[PDB]
């Protein structure tokens, strides 16, 4: 649906964290 | 502490209400750094547009009205952003096995925010509705003395499936929490003054390993 | 018509933009909308509401209700067709005072309905890019709605300040606003049926210049 | 801009008025 034209971009970069 | 705050604190509220203001996070002077970080940031002209997730205009103002600038916490001159990230790791990673079925191992950058007064904001919106990986919003305000009677700038949270909302002033050295999918549609109504904040988002392991595979 | 519009729609208007009007029609009158309003959405004729630049075949999450589009003349719409009237007739005799509007047109009455479940419609504008649309015109037919309880409030975001008007969808109620960027507004979440009708009329010149 | 992405559509018709 719609949802995604309003949600903000995450960026390119997931980092890791935690384990 | 941060992990007395974290068990006794933030992981209650975030199960019981998918929602936690900490007030007072770092402090007077770690947060007026902070603010000096990103204002110098502002001030070199480092800060573009905010982007949406499937963009179909070039300008999107009307969508969200904010200018961004993506941080590591590395960047030499971010030392004191780069510490504010730590410590949120660290309370969010003392978190895991606390918060329902979710297995923190991943954030993203991160997102410095500027809404420059003239009544920008950012629509009613879910940061998580396809199922991207993000299950954890996280935002630190930097707005000393915010009047939100004569600036606006209060983010309202509407918590699925009851008519009550969460009005969040963006109080300098505030710490908000909240989960980033369809249970927390939230918007930032207009501002009229400069309104800083920095945003991470933390990812699910399963979660994101699916949404790897999705996409 | 002269009297509520000269002595109290026009001086609102120009001086805020925004002119609510209770009591419009009468409990019975009113009533009788809400009937042939429940007759539309009972047949199932309902549609999904549309943007202007429409990109997704679903779009709930910016505007959730479902609507229909009424001339007034329909069989069976008899009062519909009267609250037209009234409103035109309002419109009229406001020309050459609603600021330096000159009003010659009018949509359709869209039929609106939020189906409770937390549907709404995100903050915006009716007229961005000068369609011709310069009053929105909203009737409200929902009796004893608790804005508490059921949400569904219009949040108007009056352009240069700060401050906001509230307005509860009520019963009977009569709602003007300008339709361009001076009023941004939203509606928000609602947790009943809510139902509404709207008629927004056009400036002659600007109409013309769109087109 | 994507203001018109959030705006209700008007239809395709308009109705005469007034003069
Ligand atoms: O800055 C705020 O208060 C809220 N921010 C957001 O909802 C966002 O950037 O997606
Ligand atoms: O129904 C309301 O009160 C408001 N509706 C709208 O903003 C619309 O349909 O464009
Ligand atoms: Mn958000
Ligand atoms: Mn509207």
């Known amino acids: 649906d719609a949802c995604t034209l ?3 971009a ?6 890791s964290l935690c384990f | 502490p941060a992990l007395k705050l974290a068990l006794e ?4 509220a975030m199960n019981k209400h998918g929602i936690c203001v900490v007030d007072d ?3 007077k002077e770690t947060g007026q750094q902070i603010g000096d970080e990103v204002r110098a940031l502002h001030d070199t002209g480092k800060f573009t547009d905010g982007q949406l997730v499937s963009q179909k205009s070039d300008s999107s103002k009307d969508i969200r009205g904010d200018k961004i600038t993506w941080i590591e916490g590395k960047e030499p001159g971010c030392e004191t952003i780069g510490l504010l990230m730590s410590s949120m790791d660290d309370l969010i990673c003392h978190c895991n096995g606390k918060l329902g079925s979710y297995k923190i191992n991943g954030r993203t950058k991160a997102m410095v925010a500027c809404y420059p007064g003239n009544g920008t904001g950012y629509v009613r919106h879910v940061d998580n509705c396809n199922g991207d990986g993000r ?3 996280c935002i630190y305000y930097l707005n000393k003395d915010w009047d939100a009677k ?6 309202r949270i509407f918590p699925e499936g009851k ?7 963006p109080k300098f050295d505030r710490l908000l929490f909240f989960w980033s999918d ?5 918007e930032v109504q207009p501002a009229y003054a400069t309104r800083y904040a920095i945003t991470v988002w933390y990812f699910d392991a399963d979660e994101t390993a699916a949404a790897k595979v999705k996409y």
Chains 1, 4 share one sequence.
Do not use: K, W
């Not at chain 2, 604190?9 to 209650?12: E, K, T």
């Not at chain 2, 004569?150 to 983010?155: A, E, N």
């Not at chain 2, 008519?163 to 002033?169: M, T």
């Not at chain 2, 369809?182 to 939230?186: A, G, I, M």
């Open chain 2, 25 to 27: 996070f770092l402090g």
């Open chain 2, 182 to 186: 369809r249970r927390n549609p939230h």
């Open chain 2, 135 to 137: 299950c954890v919003t």
């Open chain 2, 163 to 169: 008519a009550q909302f969460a009005d969040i002033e």
């Open chain 1, 10 to 15: 995450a960026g390119d970069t997931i980092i």
């Open chain 1, 6 to 8: 309003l949600a903000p």
């Open chain 2, 9 to 12: 604190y933030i992981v209650p």
């Open chain 2, 150 to 155: 004569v600036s606006g700038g209060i983010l």
